[PDB]
């Protein structure tokens, strides 16, 4: 990256098997609740 | 607590086509805790450090920073 450059998602080819891991890493989508004070019931209603 | 730094770091890798003015020359406020390793990074990259100034802190403060 750079200093004034904002970080940006990029897919390197030099380390082995890192492309697949970065695709799966950017494809999870933060699949949990951040607070989780009250859990919603099964299929909501 | 906060240092006012001003340093230049040249490019000893291949030359970059992005302007990169800020990387070459910058002035930024760094906290006291990160300043040792951040200085050490500029120490590593072979860049000159021009101006170091304590922005917030007072010297010789034993408690309360």
């Amino acid at each position: 990256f750079g200093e004034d450059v904002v970080p940006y998602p990029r897919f390197p080819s030099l380390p082995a098997g890192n492309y697949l891991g970065s695709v799966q890493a950017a494809a999870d989508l933060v699949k949990q609740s951040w607070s989780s004070l009250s859990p919603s019931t099964l299929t909501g209603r | 607590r906060l240092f006012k730094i001003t340093a230049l770091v040249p490019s000893l890798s291949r030359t970059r086509t992005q302007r990169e003015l800020q990387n070459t020359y910058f002035t930024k406020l760094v906290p006291y805790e990160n300043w040792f390793r951040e200085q050490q990074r500029i120490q590593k990259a072979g860049g000159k450090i021009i101006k170091v100034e304590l922005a917030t802190g007072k010297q010789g403060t034993n408690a309360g920073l």
């Binding site: 949990q32 607070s35 919603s40 019931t41 299929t43 909501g44 | -």
Partner: protein, 159 residues
């Protein structure tokens, strides 16, 4: 786009753009005029579209009651931003004339995300259908069904 889809299809073939591809491009230009007008009239009142859609479909049900997926204030705001997202992407896929950008953008992982979070699918399908009715009433007939093609593509991808 539709243009880049035409170019990619001709590039796979290895030939140039002769008259069949040119006629597809003329067709795309003729519909692109009304597509621009529909993009303006959709970006006018996107908030009112999402508001009318949730008021028609999701409000006063069990999911917005205590013991539902849309009970909490954080969850209600996530619902608003997801429907806002479906309207905005369907606008993008309408202007491209091509649903592959829409698929690659949201239908990549939204299935697993709504699986893991426990979000109901069918209520989202009903909400997307309510968005489709509201935008078809607001914009017009042919641009309304052009919007509805990609909104139904979203609703079929989630199901």
């Amino acid at each position: 786009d539709a243009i880049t889809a035409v170019i990619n299809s001709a590039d796979v073939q290895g030939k140039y753009l002769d008259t069949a591809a040119l006629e597809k491009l003329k067709a795309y230009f003729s519909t692109g005029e009304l597509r621009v007008r529909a993009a303006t009239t959709i970006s006018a009142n996107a908030a009112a579209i999402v508001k009318e859609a949730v008021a028609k479909s999701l409000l006063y049900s069990d999911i917005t009651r205590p013991g539902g997926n849309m009970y909490t204030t954080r969850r209600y705001a996530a619902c608003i931003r997801d429907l806002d997202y479906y309207l905005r992407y369907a606008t993008y896929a309408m202007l491209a004339g091509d649903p592959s950008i829409l698929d690659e953008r949201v239908l990549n992982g939204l299935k697993e995300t709504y699986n893991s979070l426990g979000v109901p699918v069918g209520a989202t399908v009903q909400a997307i259908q309510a968005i489709k009715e509201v935008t078809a009433s607001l914009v017009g007939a042919d641009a309304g069904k052009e919007m509805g093609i990609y909104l139904d593509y979203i609703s079929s991808g989630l199901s």
